[PDB]
Design a binder for this molecule. Structure first.
Ligand SMILES: CCCCCCCCCO[C@@H]1O[C@H](CO)[C@@H](O)[C@H](O)[C@H]1O
Ligand SMILES: CCCCCCCCCO[C@@H]1O[C@H](CO)[C@@H](O)[C@H](O)[C@H]1O
Ligand SMILES: CCCCCCCCCO[C@@H]1O[C@H](CO)[C@@H](O)[C@H](O)[C@H]1O
Length: 433
């Protein structure tokens, strides 16, 4: 039936999300091995974490040209082997290498990993926004998207299971085995990746200039232009805070009480992994499901308004209190923030970009919005740990706060898409003039 295809798109998101966010769990292990006394150098850590998102935009433009030039049959398999191969190179950095060289190895691998993650990313959204043509398209897009939560959660679960498996060996003095742990964290993605590879198998300028002419004509009208403006702005603005925080969740949990001077190597990695699992289990993950049950009841806009403005509050509390109040209150607010990312702006920007636009131009408008998002992701990703050193963590969280208020403001540019057919509205718009 139609069901099996949406699951396959789901496992595509799951694998993309796992590979993206697992770097947050891998980085503190790389620190313990290759930079035990100092931290990972700020610029190198930022480059390593932005790498996958940088490749992600290169992927969907490149796999876009090839997919348009020679059709969908050209791309469907090749994107997945690229992330499999990129996973294996990343997994197998020479252990006898110098720390900066190991880091540079992983960043480059993660760019190519990103290029593949850039493959199926918008194509899993289109297949069911085109297919459904029903009020329950939002509940469907949201169900596919929720696999981003499971990607981050399973990575955290994999991490505590892995560390607690190495418990006795680390306690008995074999401290280099954390170099084997971080390879297992990346490597375990290969199990669904190979599973899915097998399941997936078992006048060009004249046309482009004609589509460009329709696109420009469409988005040169205000009530049509602002919907593209608001779609680009909302996705751009939320990804600054969202990927800034989530690619560095282990870093924030370290000003909060979860990193300390007490305890040994196991005690360190294990409470830090304990902090990560709490946040994603209690906040990051359930937010997707609160959205799932309410988008086709409350509407998309009311959920972004709430999402931006609620995550703003907890960012302001973090920014104001992080250096001044105890662990507990901060851990709660940080979890509340994560909850209202996914019960809110992060989930709705994705749906709104897929739902706003009539099909005759939907491909570009969704692509331009997704590209705008990745731009916001790479700014914070490229600079988060550098700013944290130049201006401090509280000052960065004040920046994230401001982007949430701008997101709230920009959401007024959008039409509510709950229950609307964008092709019909385009249709009456035209029969009306
Ligand atoms: C599926 C795609 C696979 C991509 C894997 C390519 C890894 C690139 C290897 O990096 C190279 O090795 C050293 C890194 O420390 C440096 O000598 C050199 O500057 C750098 O270019
Ligand atoms: C399709 C190309 C795939 C090539 C994979 C070759 C892997 C060779 C083994 O690598 C080794 O991995 C160990 C940790 O796992 C490190 O201790 C060691 O330094 C490194 O040499
Ligand atoms: C100098 C900055 C000024 C920009 C002003 C904000 C633009 C608001 C656009 O109004 C729009 O009118 C539509 C009805 O036609 C509503 O459906 C939609 O919700 C609403 O967003």
């Amino acid at each position: 039936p139609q069901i099996k295809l949406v699951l396959l798109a789901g496992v595509g998101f799951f694998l993309d999300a796992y590979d993206l966010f697992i770097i947050n769990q891998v980085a503190p292990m790389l620190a313990q091995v290759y930079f035990p006394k100092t931290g990972l150098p700020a610029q190198r850590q930022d480059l390593m974490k932005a790498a996958a998102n940088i490749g992600c935009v290169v992927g969907q433009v490149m796999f876009g040209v090839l997919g348009d030039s020679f059709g969908r049959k050209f791309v469907y398999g090749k994107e997945l082997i690229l992330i499999i191969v990129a996973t294996i190179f990343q997994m197998s950095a020479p252990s006898h290498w110098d720390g900066n060289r190991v880091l540079t190895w992983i960043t480059i691998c993660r760019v190519f990993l990103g290029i593949g993650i850039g493959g199926d990313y918008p194509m899993s959204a289109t297949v069911v926004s085109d297919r459904a043509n029903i009020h329950r398209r939002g509940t469907l897009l949201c169900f596919i998207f929720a696999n981003q939560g499971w990607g981050s959660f399973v990575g955290s679960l994999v991490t505590i299971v892995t560390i607690s498996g190495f418990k006795h060996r680390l306690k008995s003095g074999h401290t280099h085995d954390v170099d084997k742990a971080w390879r297992i964290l990346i490597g375990l993605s290969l199990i669904p990746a190979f599973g899915t590879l097998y399941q997936r198998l078992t006048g060009v300028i004249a046309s482009k200039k004609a589509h460009w002419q329709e696109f420009v004509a469409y988005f040169s009208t205000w009530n049509h232009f602002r919907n593209l403006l608001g779609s680009m702005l909302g996705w751009f603005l939320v990804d600054i805070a969202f990927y800034g925080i989530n690619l560095n969740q282990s870093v924030v949990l370290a000003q909060i009480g979860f990193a300390g001077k007490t305890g040994d190597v196991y005690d360190k990695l294990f409470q830090l992994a304990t902090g990560n699992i709490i946040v994603t289990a209690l906040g990051f993950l359930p937010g997707y499901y609160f959205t799932l049950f309410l988008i086709d009841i409350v509407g998309r806009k009311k959920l972004q308004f709430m999402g931006f403005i609620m995550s703003g509050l907890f960012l302001a509390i973090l920014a104001g209190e992080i250096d001044h109040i105890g662990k507990g209150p901060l851990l709660a607010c940080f979890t509340f923030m994560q909850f209202f990312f996914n019960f809110g702006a992060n989930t709705t920007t994705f749906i709104v970009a897929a739902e706003l636009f009539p099909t005759r131009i939907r491909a570009s408008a969704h692509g331009i919005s997704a590209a705008a998002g990745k731009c916001g992701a790479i700014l914070s990703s490229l600079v988060f740990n550098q700013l944290k050193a130049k201006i401090g963590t509280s000052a960065v969280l004040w920046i994230f706060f401001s982007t949430c208020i701008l997101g709230f403001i920009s959401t007024f540019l959008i039409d509510e898409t709950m229950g609307v057919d964008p092709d019909e509205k385009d249709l009456e718009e035209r029969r009306a003039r």
